[PDB]
Curated annotation (Swiss-Prot), chain A:
Residues 1-241 are annotated as: Transactivation AF-2. One of its GO terms (molecular function) is chromatin DNA binding. The keyword Transcription applies. GO terms for biological process: cell differentiation; cholesterol homeostasis; hormone-mediated signaling pathway; intracellular receptor signaling pathway; mRNA transcription by RNA polymerase II; negative regulation of cholesterol storage; negative regulation of cold-induced thermogenesis; negative regulation of DNA-templated transcription. There is a cross-link at residues 191, 229 (Glycyl lysine isopeptide (Lys-Gly) (interchain with G-Cter in SUMO2)). Signal peptide: none annotated. This is Oxysterols receptor LXR-beta. Forms a heterodimer with RXR. Interacts with CCAR2 (via N-terminus) in a ligand-independent manner. Interacts (when sumoylated) with GPS2; interaction with GPS2 onto hepatic acute phase protein promoters prevents N-Cor corepressor complex dissociation. Interacts with ABCA12 and ABCA1; this interaction is required for ABCA1 localization to the cell surface and is necessary for its normal activity and stability. Changing residue 191 to R: Impaired ability to act as an anti-inflammatory role during the hepatic acute phase response. Sumoylated by SUMO2 at Lys-191 and Lys-229 during the hepatic acute phase response, leading to promote interaction with GPS2 and prevent N-Cor corepressor complex dissociation. Residues 4-241 form the NR LBD domain. It is found in: Nucleus.
Length: 241, 232
């Protein structure tokens, strides 16, 4: 690896780590999960869903801040930064969620200590069409066994996707993406020099994330039909309105 | 390149050319409402022709008939629109900004609008087409991309995803080696190609939205397309 590729990876990893520290700091601010008689009532379902929207709000805000720290992001015009973040945020959340899936327990751990089973998501009113694919994707991500440098680079590559809607300088976005693809290629070559299909398997995950983003749109659309509104920051990125 | 890999690549290239060479009669291309439905009927029929090619090509991709019938159907259902977009990109002429079906039938961005397709559908297909032309894939690269697209284990309703992924592997290896030997000083060739598979997933959603917009606009897919793209 060149010094510049090493610097680049260190920057992304360190920025990610500041984001994690913020999550740990805000865990005490989150409205506790109802550990109630869990009486299959309408009230506690709303409380679970609301508690989940707060985790999502935390992640959406960290993603905004992380992207300013990604070398090159600030060279794009503000309208393209917005467009790239609009589209890639849900995909980055899915990657960060897969990274926190525990295949042994079949549970996901957000923030510092908040851990959730399949049925926990079901209990917040999320549809099976949403839950099941996210868990499939997470266990697929685990088989690759990505480290910190690999997750971070994948995320940067995801941010600089030139086929997002409303992008005004798509060629420019592709040229900012290329150094990240290059660093991921060189890094995987050096780390597992005898698994040559690892690199293309990682990029295939970018493909899966597009489908999941679609699934997510249908979930939010099912929310509109159920009269469940999202909080302002989430509504701002994901509702058509 | 090993003999097994040359065999497989050549098989795809020759299959692709024989599917093309062999492929009929169509509704004449003719602004009134009768005329909208006309142009639309016309393109619907060109799309059926393409579906027939793709289906015939898939059953000749080594690996495809090793799968159960259910997975065969599931992978074709999902792949068809994506391969069609790939074939459409291939028939884009950069110099005329027009797309040519079947040697002869030629159309511009306007022609697609005059047949009542969303602009939200047309503009992304033309963006993809021209991006695909910059990449300049050769016959082997296209063929191999298509086979890789077919064997995506994450399609809806796949029963044996581990098997589908196992079958995708040798096509991915063959594309890696082909690009290393045929373009040795373009390191990112290979990943740029795989990144088109990402674009295609999103184009697939855009297409579902266009199918949905036909449903509320009282515009019916003909039965062979309906079997693929309508719900229920
Ligand atoms: O944990 C951290 O440190 C920061 C972080 C990183 C990633 C995710 C995260 O919180 C996610 C909270 C759980 N979640 C909420 C959610 C996300 C996106 C949209 C919606 C909504 F629009 F539907 F409201 C919701 Cl409710 C759900 C989670 C999930 C996991 C497993 C099955 C089903 C759902 C999820 C969904 C989409 C993307 C990522 C996670 C905090
Ligand atoms: O010409 C050949 O040799 C065989 C061939 C190869 C590729 C395409 C093809 O048919 C062209 C049909 C044009 N088309 C119709 C269409 C395709 C897919 C879905 C739908 C529907 F769901 F809307 F019904 C339609 Cl109407 C549209 C075409 C297009 C190009 C550019 C802008 C807008 C639309 C297209 C759309 C999607 C995928 C491929 C082509 C025959």
């Amino acid at each position: 690896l060149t010094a510049a590729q090493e610097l680049m990876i260190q920057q992304l990893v360190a920025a990610q780590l500041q984001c994690n520290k913020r999550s740990f700091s805000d865990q005490p601010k989150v409205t506790p999960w109802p550990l109630g008689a869990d009486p299959q009532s309408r009230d506690a379902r709303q409380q679970r869903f609301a508690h989940f929207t707060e985790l999502a709000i935390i992640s959406v805000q960290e993603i905004v801040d992380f992207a300013k720290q990604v070398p090159g992001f600030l060279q794009l015009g503000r309208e393209d930064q917005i467009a790239l973040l609009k589209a890639s945020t849900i995909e980055i959340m899915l990657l960060e969620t897969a990274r926190r899936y525990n295949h042994e327990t079949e549970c996901i751990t957000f923030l510092k200590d908040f851990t959730y089973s399949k049925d926990d998501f079901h209990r917040a009113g999320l549809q099976v069409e949403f839950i099941n694919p996210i868990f499939e994707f997470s266990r697929a991500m685990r088989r690759l066994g990505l480290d910190d440098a690999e997750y971070a680079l994948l995320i940067a590559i995801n941010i600089f996707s030139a086929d997002r809607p409303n992008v005004q300088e798509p060629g420019r976005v592709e040229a900012l993406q290329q150094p990240y693809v290059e660093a991921l290629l060189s890094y995987t070559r050096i780390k597992r020099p005898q698994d040559q299909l690892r690199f293309p398997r990682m990029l295939m995950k970018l493909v899966s994330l597009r489908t999941l983003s679609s699934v997510h749109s249908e979930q939010v659309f099912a929310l509109r039909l159920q009269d469940k509104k999202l909080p302002p920051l989430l509504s701002e990125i994901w509702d058509v309105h």
